[PDB]
Amino acid sequence: SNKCDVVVVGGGISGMAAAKLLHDSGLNVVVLEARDRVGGRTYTLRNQKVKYVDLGGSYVGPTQNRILRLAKELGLETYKVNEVERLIHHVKGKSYPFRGPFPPVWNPITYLDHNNFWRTMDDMGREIPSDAPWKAPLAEEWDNMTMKELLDKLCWTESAKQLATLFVNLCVTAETHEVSALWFLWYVKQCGGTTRIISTTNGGQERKFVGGSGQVSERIMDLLGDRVKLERPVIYIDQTRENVLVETLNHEMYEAKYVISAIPPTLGMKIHFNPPLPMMRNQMITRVPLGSVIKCIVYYKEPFWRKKDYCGTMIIDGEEAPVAYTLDDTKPEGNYAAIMGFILAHKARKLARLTKEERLKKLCELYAKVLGSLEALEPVHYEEKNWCEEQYSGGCYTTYFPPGILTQYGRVLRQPVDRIYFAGTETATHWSGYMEGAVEAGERAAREILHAMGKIPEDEIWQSEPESVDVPAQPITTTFLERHLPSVPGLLRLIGLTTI
Amino acid sequence: SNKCDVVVVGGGISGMAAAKLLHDSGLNVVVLEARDRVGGRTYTLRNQKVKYVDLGGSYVGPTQNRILRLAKELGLETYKVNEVERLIHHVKGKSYPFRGPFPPVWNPITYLDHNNFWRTMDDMGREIPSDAPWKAPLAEEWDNMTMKELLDKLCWTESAKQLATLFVNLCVTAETHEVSALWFLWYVKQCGGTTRIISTTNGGQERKFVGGSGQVSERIMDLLGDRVKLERPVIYIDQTRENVLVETLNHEMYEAKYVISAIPPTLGMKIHFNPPLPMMRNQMITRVPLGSVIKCIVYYKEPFWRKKDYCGTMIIDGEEAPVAYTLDDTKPEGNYAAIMGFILAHKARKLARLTKEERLKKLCELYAKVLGSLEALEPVHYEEKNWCEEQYSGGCYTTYFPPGILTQYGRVLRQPVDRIYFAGTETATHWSGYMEGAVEAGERAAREILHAMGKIPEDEIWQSEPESVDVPAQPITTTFLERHLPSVPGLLRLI
Ligand SMILES: *Cc1cc2c(cc1C)nc1c(=O)[nH]c(=O)nc-1n2C[C@H](O)[C@H](O)[C@H](O)COP(=O)(O)OP(=O)(O)OC[C@H]1O[C@@H](n2cnc3c(N)ncnc32)[C@H](O)[C@@H]1O
Ligand SMILES: *Cc1cc2c(cc1C)nc1c(=O)[nH]c(=O)nc-1n2C[C@H](O)[C@H](O)[C@H](O)COP(=O)(O)OP(=O)(O)OC[C@H]1O[C@@H](n2cnc3c(N)ncnc32)[C@H](O)[C@@H]1O
Ligand SMILES: O=C(/C=C/c1ccc([N+](=O)[O-])cc1)c1cccc(C(F)(F)F)c1
Ligand SMILES: O=C(/C=C/c1ccc([N+](=O)[O-])cc1)c1cccc(C(F)(F)F)c1
């Protein structure tokens, strides 16, 4: 057996952040990675047509201070996603250009319903602890309904219900009827709320890395040298003896004091455990699927949309549209002009049937209609990735919880199992599901093991992160009217009262 | 490498039934079983205190003709679960004895609501094809709601809603909010409807095997001898070459023409595939969990409940009771007196933190209240099994489908992947979830391979089963009033 202090299972950002922290603390670490590459749900493709393109996780933004600090220490820089010109909301076959993060509504009743929907998402979120969502006062009531049921109760207009549906599909790559209401309200609150999660400027989609996000994992592999073992899928973990034994598919054995599991929770099923997992984890890892998404990038000779005063952002409502959301993916130098689009949830399953050429044609025909531009029918290049086909991811972006699961099984997600500690973005308390959460969880898991070894005290396991000086966060603010305008049922109550 | 015609992954009833059919046709089969035993979600324990006890699947009944034919060929006999005396419904802290399968109600409003609930479950089922529930006319509408939402719409009384909730929890060991309405309605319809699934006399719980259901898998292992490899968990299947390669955790390699996967669908995740699975199966096997149950058997000196004209069946409403359902588990001779109870769904997770002795005390105090007998506080022995703990089952009785999954992924469950064919009770079209469905699926998967080999024609893949002579089925009937009484909103629309 190959002997070390800590085996890290998985070479995504979480496992690589864990391994780097442990290596820097003076321990002997090994990273066992299933694939022929590091990065996991991040993947930067390089070729002469695109130069570089992120086919997995890409965007970072204000309040994501751990990924920004890690990236800066590795010599990486960010640039801003194009948001100079107007955004587009496409609804019932017509485009409506706008500014600001939320598509606006003019109809007064519809205005009250939209304002109440976003306000209520955040009001409910403030009842949910980031590190223990199952402790919310109405946790059981909220966990026993789907997001579809919650929107059916909250939304008194079809306009608000259709926009809210798109919001859920785009944030968690799942249908409203698939996901727990408690879990979704937790997910949004632990990113900083509705405004922060949906925004480009001042939110999650503000920036990208120059050269691609894959460089984070690659530059940590460069620091670790031969400690990273590629094409080593883990099949077996044995904790019955003094040292833990970790076996790989290609017949290698590793012996360690501790293990970090840095893989999505359900992919723990690919490992045979001795002794067996405790009952709650044994069942939890069969109850937590990942979402469904195809990330599609169409290349053009020029960013022609900018000449019509469109920034390249499209919010597209309708069953017929393959893509519900786009962003400008042009390089910061203004060349390799491109539109990035997501095919979400059921549409990722429905359209996986088509050829790559048939998906390109449907996307160009959609963009031509939304942008009112025949130039969208003249692409120069296309790249895509369907994350539903990945054996060692299971989907993208992240793990969703169906109704009933987070209250019954959520407490064991990051509970150690003897000498196994749990990393991965799913175990984060701030931007869980993102590259930020991967760093939070990897570093926290590594510090749990440093505490188990008596190298640090208990109060150093969870550490706050200084604010980035490069990516300052503007606060989220509301207006008097946003806070105090009545809901549609609030207005109806006021009318009933007056006429009495 | 060990060379054979077919590798069967899993030595439960489905894997054993498939291997026996292929062996009987003259093919060389190997069964690779992860555990140090056969039987899977069936397990019969023997000791002097119990003689034998089923800690997993146990009951068989009319219309389950495949498991009855297979067991009879292996030399097994059945006996009837005791249902001579009265059943008990325990409601708001009081026992109400009754006869006939459905607990009765006396309030006229509650009567219409209960009648409408059971009638509506069977009316919806008549629109769901057994072999393709995703082809129901309202498949998307029904798949996109939980059973909790359907019961909220249908049940105008708390009485009906609480009994419907117990019905879901008992049939599929899951909460009403965890499961798809389309999947649950399919599940009931594919067992023959509400009356057939809930009934002891003339339904699924009519009989048990003399000596235990574990004897089905054990006696097929006896026939196959050293073709059954115990403590061989499969870790890797490679289909890139001329022959399929199957590797085990203990470093053995098997080479075959074809493979049968006879494991619960989600336990496919414990196998690394080359090439990778197709996208829809890759995601499906992460979306299909198994239910949660503790099966508990309390032993007594005598079947003392019979002296009060109670048969030992208890249907126990409410959150406080650990056990919602019991049957008499006494042996056919009247000895080894026992009550079998299920701790269901969230209660299995809540009460697993207790000791074995703490669960025994809670069960004995519950039974003393419901049976109105101090004799229930004097157990002579106790056996239990928590199926939530099993690495190579994932739970019991079977796989449930959360909202949205059956319509999006259901078509993939029995679709072959190159030279891998899929067995397991989850792939059956009649009593899927049961030992009957295990036999149907294993024999169908085996005949798909015989057809691929050019040994039988396409029309012999799916084969009907003659009715058992020992366990004939009586027709399910309804009354004029059951068919025509209005619902509660029906009675209101008339007013
Ligand atoms: C896929 C995707 C993700 C994504 C996104 C868009 C798409 C299409 N958009 C994002 C964005 O703009 N900004 C952002 O911050 N996140 C975005 N996401 C999500 C993001 O990519 C993920 O949150 C993050 O990358 C997760 O990192 P983590 O380290 O937690 O997980 P991982 O990347 O999945 O790495 C796990 C590794 O483990 C290996 N593996 C799996 N099984 C084994 C076994 N048995 N043995 C050994 N290794 C194993 C995987 O191969 C992987 O490398
Ligand atoms: C657990 C349970 C089940 C049950 C029930 C009560 C309980 C507590 N009551 C039932 C009843 O009264 N009547 C009835 O007909 N069924 C009842 N059930 C369900 C029933 O037991 C199951 O439907 C049936 O036993 C399923 O059989 P099947 O053959 O489909 O599946 P299995 O028993 O799970 O067998 C699978 C085998 O595969 C092995 N395994 C798993 N992974 C591997 C790998 N990787 N490699 C090799 N072998 C593997 C398992 O160990 C198992 O033996
Ligand atoms: O929810 C959004 C975006 C979310 C999001 C989340 C994650 C990722 N990603 O991980 O890449 C991208 C977009 C989002 C954006 C603009 C408008 C709206 C709308 F208000 F619903 F209209 C919603
Ligand atoms: O649904 C039942 C039984 C189901 C059942 C299903 C499976 C098994 N098993 O696999 O052991 C046992 C009982 C059942 C029985 C009697 C009364 C009721 C009630 F009407 F809901 F009250 C329901």
Which numbered ligand comes closest to the C-alpha of B324? 4
B334: left (phi over 0), alpha (psi -120 to 50) or beta: left
User: Which of A178, A272, A277 minimises the CB distance to B270?
Assistant: A272
3-state secondary structure of A258: strand
DSSP state of A317: -
Q: How many CB atoms lie within 10 A of CB B236?
A: 17
Chain A residues within 8 A of B282 when measuring between CB atoms: 388-391, 394
Scanning every residue of chain A, which has its alpha carbon at the shortest distance from the alpha carbon of B270?
Answer: A270
Cβ-based neighbours of B376, under 8 Å, separated by 6 or more: B298, B300, B304, B364, B365, B367, B368
**Residue ranges matching CATH 3.50.50.60 in chain A:** 2-40+62-77+210-288+402-462
B106 burial (CB, 10 Å; 0-12 / 13-18 / 19+) is exposed
**From residue A158, how far is each of A145, A155, A163, B224 by CA, in Å?**
20, 7, 9, 63
- Contact residues, B window 168-197, toward A, CB-based 8 Å cutoff: 175, 177-178
CA distance B246 to B255: 6
CA distance B180 to B431: 18
Phi, psi of B20 (to 5 degrees): -60, -45
The CATH number fitting domain B107-198, selected from 3.40.50.2300, 1.10.405.10, 3.40.190.10, 3.40.50.1220:
1.10.405.10
Ligand 1 and A236: CB distance under 6 A: no
Which numbered ligand comes closest to the C-alpha of B71? 2
CA distance A211 to A44: 8
Q: What dihedral do alpha carbons B296, B302, B307, B313 form, nearest 10°?
A: 20
Instruction: Give the strand order in the sheet containing A244-248.
Output: A2-3, A253-256, A244-248, A234-238, A272-274
| A424 in Cβ contact with A262 (< 8 Å) | yes
Amino acid at A424: G
DSSP state of A415: -
**Cis preceding linkage at B421, omega within 30:** no
User: Are the Cβ atoms of A389 and B282 closer than 8 angstroms?
Assistant: yes
Chain A residues within 8 A of B236 when measuring between CB atoms: 235, 249
What is the CATH class of B41-61+78-106+199-209+289-401? alpha beta
| B224 in Cβ contact with B23 (< 8 Å) | yes
Helix or strand (DSSP H, E) at A70: helix A65-73
- Contact residues, B window 378-437, toward A, CB-based 8 Å cutoff: 386, 388-391, 394-395, 402-405, 408
Distance from CA of A358 to the nearest CA of B (A): 18
Mutation choice for ligand 2 from B32, B37, B41, CB with most ligand atoms inside 8 A: B41
CA distance B470 to B338: 26
CA distance A468 to B23: 68
| B85 in Cβ contact with B315 (< 8 Å) | no
Task: Kindly state whether B98 is in contact with chain A, defined as any CB-CB distance less than 8 angstroms.
Answer: no
Resolution, in Å, please?
1.8
**Residue ranges matching CATH 3.90.660.10 in chain A:** 41-61+78-106+199-209+289-401
> A316 alpha carbon to ligand 3 midpoint, in Å?
11
Specify which residues A78 forms β-bridges with.
A209
**Residue ranges matching CATH 1.10.405.10 in chain A:** 107-198
What is the CATH class of B2-40+62-77+210-288+402-462? alpha beta
DSSP string spanning B406-418? HHHHGGGTT--BT
Amino acid at B327: L
Pairing of strands B234-238, B244-248: antiparallel
Q: Give the ligand 3 atom nearest the CA of A163.
A: 21
Pick from A161, A274, A287 the residue to mutate for testing the B interface (most B CBs within 10 Å).
Answer: A287
Ligand 1 and A297: CB distance under 6 A: no
DSSP string spanning B36-88? SSS-TT--EEEETTTEEEESS--EE-TT-HHHHHHHHHTT--EEEPP-SSEEE
CA distance B81 to B58: 11
Which numbered ligand comes closest to the C-alpha of A208? 1
> What tokens were used for A259?
């293990």
CA triplet B352, B358, B360: central angle to 5 degrees?
95
> A171 alpha carbon to ligand 1 midpoint, in Å?
16
